[PDB]
Subunit: 251 residues, 4 copies
């Protein structure tokens, strides 16, 4: 079990990619603390994963709120004695249309949850990882960071920013033995992406436009994340891995 | 005169790269409106460029203020009858240290001026460009967007975000015949960059680390911006050009 | 005349992009030597350009032949006293199909003319540029280097190799004050690309698939090349500029 | 065992990164056929891995020879019934100096072993993978493809070409359900890379120069390759993963 005795936080982990990641980390031996905004979602997720015999607890954490971030870390520290792994997976996107039409308020919300919360969550775990001799951070971006989704401009820009955040954190935290990498999913079937593939007609347009044979599933993302969070990836930092089924990204 | 009869706004154009850009656009035939936060800097710059026989006026514009952005555009419309070119050059960096220590307030200032103000300035000019049958927008990022400068993390992240912003704007404004490109300077001698190349020992270390033969000067950036803002670049959009004297960037 | 008194070689310059580049360099003040494989194509091109008042002469040069390369440089040296600029534009593509079916002989032809000939042509001009205090090399690649064209695999791979060649030459020739940059055209209307945009149905499919408003013309490439070959671009080396009308390339 | 019952070929697998990959694939359940040019090296490697209880056989295969490539595939088919995985790891570099001084003979050798042999090896395995319903190909490039090593220009160019080859093969083989990915190692301690980390002066220098805390070991590359060759990576194709310990690569 590659993550035996490790303690992982996964934000936004009560559905979709975050849940698949949390499940896999726990299957690979970690103690996982799951979280999201709504208590009912946390409760259901914890119950499901505990029912699979996994070492999982959970609490509400809206990543945009400082007190919630601090309480999430405190929970891991108090139940398990520290934190080894952070998977930062939360995102918001309250906008669709031409980028130039997005309001200042839309930009503030997207930049706060998608970019600032990521770095502030990382700041919250770093001192705990230092106590453990190091750790791993994985940030969830998007292939739209490289090749933008039509009509998702502000979101896409926040995801490009995360590419840069990954690189800067990896350089700046290397002296602390903390690795920082990034997952850039393609079109993965989830509630957050659902509108893009709800109609069979829109789904088939997406597949032709993205040049993919199938849509991804949340579990298509879980293996690479578990691997990157493991000591077997000790010479991998500052790296983005695209999980996009062949859709274009970068050289 | 490749920009004869064109009207250009250059933000943050009372020193450094923005001044060199404003000078060159005007030498190339444009009517240029220069601006920055301080009236004395605007006055000095306008006097200098007028004294060189260039068609230049100026006003105060703090790009982070909606009223200032609107008034800048209105000034160009009222004097010259429209706007053809926007060069968005303003940036702030209130931070020098390890990225993990930057507070929410530091992130808010950097993201507001460096990212949000860029898009909101673009939104302010687009309707005027549409009336003219098209236009050119040039956003100033940094080679740090690709290869981060040490101690400059939050700033570097904002500059990466601008690579994304350029791409999204280029796609979305193409139907309106508005091109959007980006200049990514390397180590250029300006007041803003002084900490990096100040002392002889730090300068020699920067040249060896960056693998450059000389530091750049502001005028080294001006020609490409003028070219990109011209109709001779009509099939060039969505592009970032690095002006870095051979320092590393990307394939 | 930004290239007044400069001497330029443009390979493969009797049609298409090469011809547009040669015309523009000469319009901007350079003495240009054009060349290609067939004397008839050379004669037609020299007649046209001399008819426009331009300082152009020509010779046969198949870039894959060492003797031809040597004689081309010697011609420029004899006519004009040296060489300042090399634009390397030749390419071959004897293949249209799935990459897995191309034989060793197809690869040998493509790699020889598209890659080896480029570096060997550069080697031939370097000593002449040294005598002049420096010079400029521009290599013509393709947006297919980043996002491969369908059925053009072996060619696309050669074009990616040229990105690497540009970077390596720019680093290794900087001490000689020789800059090396690359032009990566998108879908430009030429004889070479005819099968891709020929019938109206395939043209509309290419414009949608590439996300462009129009196809490019050879002259759309000429301005950036002239600029990069000028002393106004003295702080630009190791850079690829895509001329693709907003088709996808890279951050 | 993520690769249980799978059959893998790893070229150039009797030392260094190739050996670590072969070892790990076999530890993860695969039947592996190792190979390289010299029978003594093959024998030694097979003996070592068999001694560890791994399902390994070997044969001589100079990847530049068609008959050797054909016979390697045939061996796996005759012993195991098919081929699921190809790891293409062979490389040559008979040159050290300025790229411009590399002769045609040098270029021919590098392009033949490093680029052509890779695609020809892939062609040899594709029909066998089709009989199995799909498969995985992993090409070994280098971080030098993005940021060239000094004095290794022709080699670096060949590695950049492999980034393009990976992308083109991934697109063109997707209809056959064959995934194609690439490993780009950084500074890994091996015989091949010895010149970059000779004595204590050049080792501590290149750590500061490349911005890494340690040199890599061949096993640092093995986990990602095994992962990418597994069905857990079924939504990952056309991807390059850098294993570079924080050395610069790309966004
Ligand atoms: N789906 C795709 O095609 C795809 C593609 C590219 C990128 N992504 C990225 O993948 C990540 C996960 O998205 P997903 O598609 O897997 O979403 P999903 O299935 O819709 O799940 C969203 C999860 O986020 C939680 N959440 C939302 N806002 C939160 C906040 N402020 N703080 C904490 N938790 C929050 C939700 O629970 P609560 O409602 O209880 O808060 C839920 O657990 C995001 O970074 C997204 O940008 C997804
Ligand atoms: N120098 C480098 O090595 C380097 C490298 C990469 C990128 N860049 C980029 O180049 C651009 C220009 O920087 P520089 O180095 O040329 O700077 P500089 O010489 O120090 O000049 C800064 C200019 O910006 C104005 N300014 C500052 N904040 C402003 C605001 N909020 N609104 C409007 N104007 C403002 C200043 O005038 P006031 O004080 O009157 O406002 C002044 O005209 C920036 O985007 C920077 O990030 C520079
Ligand atoms: N057209 C596009 O959409 C496009 C897109 C991406 C890249 N490009 C690149 O642009 C460059 C120019 O191509 P083009 O489309 O402009 O072609 P074009 O209009 O067909 O012109 C081809 C030119 O190359 C010459 N030529 C061919 N083989 C040669 C050789 N071995 N040695 C010397 N000259 C040779 C031809 O003259 P002779 O017959 O007399 O030899 C002719 O002058 C190439 O590098 C190409 O890969 C074009
Ligand atoms: N080490 C690094 O820092 C590093 C960095 C970037 C990339 N790489 C890449 O990693 C890969 C592995 O290199 P390495 O450093 O691990 O090498 P290594 O430890 O020196 O081993 C070289 C292996 O290749 C075999 N070989 C050489 N030429 C061959 C040929 N023509 N056909 C078949 N086998 C051949 C050798 O055995 P025989 O003598 O018996 O043929 C030996 O097994 C290469 O693609 C290399 O470019 C390594």
């Amino acid at each position: 079990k590659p993550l035996e005795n490790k303690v992982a936080l996964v934000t936004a982990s009560t559905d979709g990619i975050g849940l698949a990641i949390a499940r896999r980390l726990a299957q690979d031996g970690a103690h996982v603390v799951v979280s999201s905004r709504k208590q009912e979602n946390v409760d259901r997720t914890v119950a499901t994963l505990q029912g699979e015999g996994l070492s999982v607890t959970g609490t509400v954490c809206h990543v945009g709120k400082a007190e919630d971030r601090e309480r999430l870390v405190a929970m891991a520290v108090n139940l398990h004695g520290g934190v080894d792994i952070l998977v930062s997976n939360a995102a918001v996107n309250p906008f669709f249309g031409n980028i130039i039409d997005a309001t200042e308020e839309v930009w503030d919300k997207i930049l706060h949850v998608n970019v600032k919360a990521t770095v502030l969550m990382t700041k919250a775990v770093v001192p705990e990882m230092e106590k453990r001799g190091g750790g791993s951070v994985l940030i969830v971006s998007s292939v739209g960071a490289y090749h933008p989704f039509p009509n998702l401009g502000p979101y896409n820009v926040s995801k490009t920013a995360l590419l840069g955040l990954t690189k800067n954190l990896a350089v700046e935290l290397a002296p602390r033995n903390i690795r920082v990498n990034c997952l850039a999913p393609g079109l993965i079937k989830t509630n957050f992406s659902q509108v893009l593939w709800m109609d069979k007609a829109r789904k088939e347009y997406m597949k032709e436009s993205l040049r993919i044979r199938r849509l991804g599933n949340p579990e298509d993302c879980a293996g690479i994340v578990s691997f990157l969070c493991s000591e077997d990836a000790s010479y991998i930092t500052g790296e983005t891995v695209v999980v996009g089924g062949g859709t274009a990204s970068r050289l």
